Write a protein that binds this ligand. Structure first.
Ligand SMILES: NC(=O)c1ccc[n+]([C@@H]2O[C@H](COP(=O)([O-])OP(=O)(O)OC[C@H]3O[C@@H](n4cnc5c(N)ncnc54)[C@H](O)[C@@H]3O)[C@@H](O)[C@H]2O)c1
Ligand SMILES: NC(=O)c1ccc[n+]([C@@H]2O[C@H](COP(=O)([O-])OP(=O)(O)OC[C@H]3O[C@@H](n4cnc5c(N)ncnc54)[C@H](O)[C@@H]3O)[C@@H](O)[C@H]2O)c1
Ligand SMILES: NC(=O)c1ccc[n+]([C@@H]2O[C@H](COP(=O)([O-])OP(=O)(O)OC[C@H]3O[C@@H](n4cnc5c(N)ncnc54)[C@H](O)[C@@H]3O)[C@@H](O)[C@H]2O)c1
Ligand SMILES: NC(=O)c1ccc[n+]([C@@H]2O[C@H](COP(=O)([O-])OP(=O)(O)OC[C@H]3O[C@@H](n4cnc5c(N)ncnc54)[C@H](O)[C@@H]3O)[C@@H](O)[C@H]2O)c1
Lengths: 261, 261, 261, 261
């Protein structure tokens, strides 16, 4: 679809599953060279690699924990060593777990902040460092959430990590705009991925979530991958520092439908 | 680029010049059927029609003042009568003029509110009325500005009209999301159109405006048309109620670069 | 409570009932001179005047329709003629009525825009014109709503009017900040006033509204008057261009409590 | 000024200097019992205690590093042990240092995130835990910055920490609103404190900062202390989850004055 993406090198953290996997496949279809990332073992990663080979794409899988600085540095270097350059960096890895805020341990808080926020900072830092030192007008796409805007009781660490990601992205966008480096956030609403498999399995829970989505349906990973592909393309040449919400209307305050209140 | 746009009927208000004209041409290139709109000068409209024919597109030009209710109703009906349906409604007509707020006449205030806000309401109302009565999952795209967010001294009427447009769009998006009707805003920064021809002609003024754009350059109409084409496509299927800013970073507070303050 | 408010002249539009009335009484208690405003007959206004005399306050009632320019001009002039000066201008008059957006008449749309937005513009314009011509560091307080942020299906005209008010206020705040003139918005959530008397009378409707308020209760007019008094005082000397929401948490997305979604 | 503050117990982190010190003195003047906090330099703390005694206030100083969990727990317990209860928790400690984002070390990033964000989380957690276990309708006030909204090149860690604080506060506000616990942010612009002493000492830098403030002057600590006192009082009974910016108009985009762009 986007001719300019052909030959571009794209690195996606946490891309052996869910949204990351869908984006890896979409970029492969756009003929971009993809660097898949897995945390522990390559099993889940090989699934994505075969999907990419199937569409005739080219990709490699690199092990790396985004909370480990040397791993993030190596991830970026691996892309350059294998494909000779880096064009798009997508910080997608993340985690979440529910706990009443006043009962949340420092350990749980740190795990989410370290992975969701600091991990994205490290990925952004390394990609931009490369872009700046080589005069490349690259782009960084950070995977946020409707929760960088919508508060989330029981997930205060997650909400804080994404609210932080928003300001990080806007700051990097302003700071490097003069160099032609674009930095944007994608803000997905409720999407059908493994992180919500069990939750959406229960008919009562699914109905509950769907009631919070004005469009009435839980989005598919491909609908988010579509956003990532467009933002990475030259079609979005004048777009930087924004958060593009793809949430079926979730951020529009679903409780106020029918003129309530 | 977007196969799903082929055959779609697109109506664009104030499309004989500037952004409207660029969008008309872009949609024609996507093989959509376009309805161009001119307020009074038909010669300008014929010009756009010629450009559309140059790309093998199909279009018609319809006279209509967006501040006249019957004109807006006729504009929508003309599209349906000529092409048999309506798929995308783009409210783009607008005007602006500088006046210190405490010296602004009610006349000037009303002219801008009537055209920029009420005109968009009428266009949105008529398109949605049609979508609802015919079970069509159409889309409405409203042309806003970075000024639905960035205050604008000397243009208080313009700022108010776009701030109003933002809430109008979000309200319509929430209200009609259940019917599959998407409503979104495009928020352009400084773009090279006739509305800024004289301003950008002066080297001192151009440099002044460019200093307020982090990316360092005034955008081209095609960069905005690209956003409109994507939002109208099925690629943005899960996107509604947002304002997609294409401003080279203007909304990121340009005065704070280099860690100032 | 606020010693600096003693002797200050405060004009409040639509102050014969509801929030306007409560603010008039609160300012009278702060020993400010108040100018009450009624649209048709002085009956409702005399009630407020007696309440003010009761607390030992000084006030006058002036007839005026905020949609009539000459009436707004006269309202401001009346304050200056009676008390010799003007210190605080509060644009509070407003109206609302429910109608599906695609079925809303231009007449209904205009009535709400004219009263809620244009009326506030006229009041702000006249007060600021006076402040500027007499080097007075006055303040303008505009009564908004949680709906300058929260979309409102069935009330698209109201939402648009307040979204517009937000940008109007921010623009005026920026434009006149150098002159020491502060302009701020107050954003009330659901408050117990006559505009909601019937709605809250029904036990089913009240429970419905309360379910949308995190704090669990519908606010009282005095809780909003408290905000107006503080914003007008020198305690808020460095505060301008903001919208101070007093909504019991309504803007925090009530549907997401208990970690839903 | 606020009669309801008499006898209330207020804990303020990092209150031996700057804004913290000013708030400690203001609350003492309101007859509240204050718990001052110092990280290491006790002499600075004794200084604030002397100022408090000068106004006839009652206070104690407690050593504590907000990045050390046991220190935060002890800080809250010390207030309860000394004064028998806790009513207001103010997380004010913070730090910042400039570094180009692509050159920022993980160490610098973590120091700011740990202090500015995690420290505030710990303080909020401990105060709320106490409020919940004892059915106290207490309040938490978190000291943010205009930079929870305005991006800040060279201070990406600071911006991220405050953007995170915003979502943390909104989440806690929503989560505990049913229990009557209010949580709000104060967002100061440029204020005359020791953190900016050297910067404002230079006439060129001061003029530069003042040019970014619409009101034209750098605020005084007392202007922020005024906001904290009001938010803690019952006058703000229906206010929760907001960020009250006291910035002289900084968040209104100063570069757009005079209708530029
Ligand atoms: N699924 C949704 O509905 C939804 C909504 C909003 C935001 N998001 C965000 O989108 C991203 C993708 O979510 P998803 O649904 O695909 O979830 P997911 O759990 O399937 O994907 C996240 C991936 O991150 C990896 N990961 C976690 N910690 C890591 C670490 N330290 N180092 C390396 N990899 C690590 C996981 O192994 C996993 O493959 C996340 O950042 C998530 O917060 C998802
Ligand atoms: N050019 C920019 O930099 C910029 C930035 C932000 C927003 N915008 C918005 O984008 C839209 C397009 O602006 P543009 O630069 O192409 O300006 P433009 O003046 O070239 O286009 C506006 C069109 O609106 C038409 N129009 C005005 N009043 C009308 C009425 N009552 N009925 C019918 N048509 C009417 C005009 O004849 C004109 O062709 C406007 O809404 C503008 O506010 C433009
Ligand atoms: N009550 C709430 O819950 C709530 C929530 C958000 C916002 N508001 C806003 O607060 C303001 C006060 O609302 P309220 O509850 O007291 O309602 P209200 O109806 O009691 O007060 C509004 C007043 O405006 C007057 N008015 C209307 N049109 C006028 C005109 N053209 N000229 C002069 N006066 C006119 C009315 O006569 C009335 O006294 C309104 O702007 C409203 O939109 C109220
Ligand atoms: N001064 C401003 O213009 C301005 C503008 C926006 C926000 N703020 C914020 O307001 C707060 C007050 O700033 P300020 O100007 O008074 O600065 P300051 O440096 O004078 O005050 C911060 C205090 O935090 C203490 N502190 C730092 N790390 C600590 C730790 N780990 N444990 C305990 N105490 C610690 C410091 O010793 C100091 O007394 C900060 O959070 C700052 O980010 C200040």
């Amino acid at each position: 679809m986007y001719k300019d993406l052909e030959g571009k090198v794209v690195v996606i953290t946490g891309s052996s599953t869910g949204l990351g996997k869908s984006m890896a496949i979409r970029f492969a279809t756009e003929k971009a060279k993809v660097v898949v990332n897995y945390r522990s073992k390559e099993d889940e990663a090989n699934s994505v690699l075969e999907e990419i080979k199937k569409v005739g794409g080219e990709a490699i899988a690199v092990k790396g924990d985004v909370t480990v600085e040397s791993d993030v540095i190596n991830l970026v270097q691996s892309a350059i060593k294998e494909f000779g350059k880096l064009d798009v960096m997508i910080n997608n890895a993340g985690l979440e777990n529910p706990v009443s805020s006043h009962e949340m341990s420092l350990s749980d808080w740190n795990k989410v902040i370290d992975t969701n926020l600091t991990g994205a900072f490290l990925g952004s830092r390394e990609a931009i460092k490369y872009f700046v030192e080589n005069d490349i007008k690259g782009t960084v796409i950070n995977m946020s959430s409707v929760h960088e805007k919508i508060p989330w009781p029981l997930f205060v660490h997650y909400a804080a990590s994404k609210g932080g990601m928003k300001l990080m992205t806007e700051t990097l966008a302003l700071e490097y705009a003069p160099k032609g480096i674009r930095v944007n956030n994608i803000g997905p609403g409720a999407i059908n991925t493994p992180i919500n498999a069990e939750k959406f399995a229960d008919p009562e829970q699914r109905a509950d979530v769907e009631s919070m989505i004005p469009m009435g349906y839980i989005g598919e990973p491909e609908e988010i991958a579509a956003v990532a592909a467009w933002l990475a393309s030259s079609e979005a040449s004048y777009v930087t520092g924004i958060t593009l919400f793809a949430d079926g209307g979730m951020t529009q305050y679903p409780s106020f439908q029918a003129g309530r209140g």
